[PDB]
Amino acid sequence: FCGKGYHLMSFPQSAPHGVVFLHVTYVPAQEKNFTTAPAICHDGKAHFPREGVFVSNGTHWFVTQRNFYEPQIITTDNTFVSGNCDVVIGIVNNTVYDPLQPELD
Amino acid sequence: QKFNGLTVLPPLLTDEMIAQYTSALLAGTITSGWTFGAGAALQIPFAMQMAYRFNGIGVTQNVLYENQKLIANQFNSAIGKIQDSLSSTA
Amino acid sequence: YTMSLGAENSVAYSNNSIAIPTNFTISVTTEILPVSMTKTSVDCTMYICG
Ligand SMILES: *[C@@H]1O[C@H](CO)[C@@H](O[C@@H]2O[C@H](CO)[C@@H](O)[C@H](O)[C@H]2NC(C)=O)[C@H](O)[C@H]1NC(C)=O
Ligand SMILES: *[C@@H]1O[C@H](CO)[C@@H](O[C@@H]2O[C@H](CO)[C@@H](O)[C@H](O)[C@H]2NC(C)=O)[C@H](O)[C@H]1NC(C)=O
Ligand SMILES: *[C@@H]1O[C@H](CO)[C@@H](O[C@@H]2O[C@H](CO)[C@@H](O)[C@H](O)[C@H]2NC(C)=O)[C@H](O)[C@H]1NC(C)=O
Ligand SMILES: *[C@@H]1O[C@H](CO)[C@@H](O[C@@H]2O[C@H](CO)[C@@H](O)[C@H](O)[C@H]2NC(C)=O)[C@H](O)[C@H]1NC(C)=O
Ligand SMILES: *[C@@H]1O[C@H](CO)[C@@H](O[C@@H]2O[C@H](CO)[C@@H](O)[C@H](O)[C@H]2NC(C)=O)[C@H](O)[C@H]1NC(C)=O
Secondary structure, X not given: OOOOOEEEEEEEEOOOOEEEEEXXXXXXXXXXXXXXXXXXXEOOEEEEEOOOEEEEOOOOEEEEOOOOOOOEOOEOOOEEXXXXXXXXXXXXXXXXXXXXXXXXX | OOOOOOOOOOOOOOHHHHHHHHHHHHHHOOOOHHHXXXXXXXXXXXXXXXXXXXXXXXXXXXXHHHOHHHHHHHHHHHHHHHHHHHHHOO | OOOOOOOOOOOOOOOOEEEEEEEEEXXXXXXXXXXXXXXXXXXXXXXXXX
């Protein structure tokens, strides 16, 4: 509605018989190739991502926001768990780090 | 019709050219979704895209994955119902 | 000549492959809209008879 891309801000300017608007928008660029997986299997449970998608760099797995690559370790507190491992087509076998356990030592 | 000083000018865009715009359009939104309408197209597997759109309404993503078969079936039988509504209803 | 509609590039769709942006550019587009005309007026009798 207000310029191509994701609208961020606008400023009006005058004109003799009209109004000219400047619409400042965000546009993504420089995108890479990643492998994905709808959900992960860990100890028999399906771990779905909360905010973002699980993405693989070939030999490692992470979780990131869909707007901009910012990889992070797939941990218990960024992924919710529901149902069983064998239920949704497309899971992959991986591990999940639990931040609590390093504290018990 | 047109026989004494009246005419009709042809359109600039022919039927095959419009059907080429609409083929490009709905061949994009399958492969890239809203993305291709902002910048470069980004290939995203379809089922993931639908799951996201579910999150976009307010239903937890897992609902789509668990029920993927029923969803696909309802979609298909709906397209066929439209095909027949149009094929018969004047 | 016959007009071209644009470039022809097909997307490498897969069922386990996603493309993700790693940078961004903010761009300031412009838009123009009229909102008025000259408030004209004509005296009908002077125009016709004067
Ligand atoms: C994702 O990976 C593919 C292949 O690994 C990249 O490939 C090319 O894209 C062009 C576009 O038309 C195709 O014709 C080629 O067949 C693709 N494969 C090649 C050249 O090996 C693609 O560019 C990557 N996309 C992103 C966003 O990283
Ligand atoms: C995928 O990502 C992982 C994690 O970044 C990469 O593993 C790292 O490789 C670098 C380069 O040797 C090492 O310095 C790091 O120690 C590694 N990470 C750790 C701490 O395990 C991996 O090389 C990447 N591979 C691909 C194909 O993208
Ligand atoms: C995604 O597509 C690929 C290729 O179409 C599918 O791979 C086929 O899967 C069957 C069942 O496991 C295998 O017998 C075939 O050999 C696979 N083909 C290839 C070329 O690898 C895959 O199953 C699809 N679904 C995913 C990955 O979830
Ligand atoms: C995920 O891990 C499970 C657990 O190892 C795999 O299931 C095993 O499959 C092997 C190969 O046939 C069997 O020998 C084991 O008996 C299975 N374990 C159990 C407890 O069922 C499963 O194949 C893995 N899947 C993927 C995609 O990596
Ligand atoms: C995103 O794109 C911009 C566009 O140039 C990149 O900007 C330049 O980065 C180089 C890195 O060596 C700098 O030397 C230049 O000064 C930057 N240009 C400007 C406008 O100052 C930027 O680096 C890209 N993002 C990333 C993460 O590399």
